[PDB]
Amino acid sequence: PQITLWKRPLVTIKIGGQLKEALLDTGADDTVIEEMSLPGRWKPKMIGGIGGFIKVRQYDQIIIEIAGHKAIGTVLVGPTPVNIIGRNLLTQIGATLNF
Amino acid sequence: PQITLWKRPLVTIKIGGQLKEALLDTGADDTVIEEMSLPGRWKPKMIGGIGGFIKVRQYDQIIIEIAGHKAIGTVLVGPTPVNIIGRNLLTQIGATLNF
Numbered sequence: 001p002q003i004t005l006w007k008r009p010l011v012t013i014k015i016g017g018q019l020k021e022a023l024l025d026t027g028a029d030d031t032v033i034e035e036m037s038l039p040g041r042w043k044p045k046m047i048g049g050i051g052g053f054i055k056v057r058q059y060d061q062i063i064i065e066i067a068g069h070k071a072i073g074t075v076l077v078g079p080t081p082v083n084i085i086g087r088n089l090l091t092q093i094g095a096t097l098n099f
Numbered sequence: 100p101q102i103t104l105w106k107r108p109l110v111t112i113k114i115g116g117q118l119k120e121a122l123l124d125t126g127a128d129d130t131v132i133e134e135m136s137l138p139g140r141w142k143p144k145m146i147g148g149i150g151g152f153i154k155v156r157q158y159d160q161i162i163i164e165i166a167g168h169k170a171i172g173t174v175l176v177g178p179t180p181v182n183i184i185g186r187n188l189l190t191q192i193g194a195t196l197n198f
């Protein structure tokens with residue numbers, strides 16, 4: 001689809017069998033999801049945003065549906081205020097910015 | 100143009116007579132620029148991200164040239180680690196997300 005930006009670009013995602021809402025975020029390198037359980041091992045990562053840095057859990061090779069498109073890649077879990085779909089997965093669904 | 104997302108979507112902007120680089124950020128409601136002077140009145144605001152909140156100055160009716168497209172709106176100025184063009188100005192240049 002085409003998504004205009006008058007409203008937040010929120011879409012439904014499905015991860016771990018659960019539906020969640022997430023923001024399509026071209027300003028995020030990385031996908032970051034609020035606290036939840038995921039399978040497998042995780043690795044540490046620190047990511048930085050407007051207010052400073054947070055510690056997250058990095059899970060690789062996680063299956064995630066985004067707006068009906070299937071992605072498999074890295075998901076960071078931690079105290080993000082909102083679920084954000086970053087460029088690592090926006091590229092897997094073929095998203096571009098156009099003007 | 101059509102901007103793919105393999106890399107950060109950085110573009111040249113002109114604001115306050117200054118050229119800067121900024122990220123086109125669909126996950127940002129508002130435009131946030133690193134500390135600089137702008138003319139006219141301003142008022143204080145708090146804006147949150149990952150890592151918490153920062154205090155910014157809110158300037159209304161500021162003209163910014165974004166990748167050669169002129170737009171007017173509110174610009175927040177404060178200690179953001181990166182210049183961010185948010186939805187309030189992305190809409191004005193007709194930017195959409197497509198997949």
Ligand SMILES: COc1ccc(S(=O)(=O)N(CC(C)C)C[C@@H](O)[C@H](Cc2ccccc2)NC(=O)O[C@H]2CO[C@H]3O[C@@H]4OCC[C@@H]4[C@H]32)cc1
Nearest residue numbers: 027028029030048049050124126127128129147148149181
């Ligand atoms: C109300 O108006 C606002 C309020 C908040 C923001 S924001 O900058 O906090 N942000 C909101 C979002 C988290 C809901 C916009 C994002 O696009 C920021 C924009 C952003 C970019 C860089 C630095 C600070 C902020 N990106 C970000 O936090 O990315 C994180 C995750 O991936 C990494 O990529 C980024 O690049 C590496 C570090 C960050 C990490 C902007 C305008």
Ligand SMILES: [Cl-]
Nearest residue numbers: 072073074088
């Ligand atoms: Cl990935």
Ligand SMILES: [Cl-]
Nearest residue numbers: 118119120182
């Ligand atoms: Cl700059």
Ligand SMILES: [Cl-]
Nearest residue numbers: 134135136137
């Ligand atoms: Cl200045």
Ligand SMILES: [Cl-]
Nearest residue numbers: 145146147148
């Ligand atoms: Cl905010």
Ligand SMILES: [Cl-]
Nearest residue numbers: 171172173187
């Ligand atoms: Cl505005």
Ligand SMILES: [Cl-]
Nearest residue numbers: 004005190193
């Ligand atoms: Cl429109």
Ligand code: NA
Nearest residue numbers: 040059060061
């Ligand atoms: Na894994």
Ligand code: NA
Nearest residue numbers: 139140159160
């Ligand atoms: Na003003």
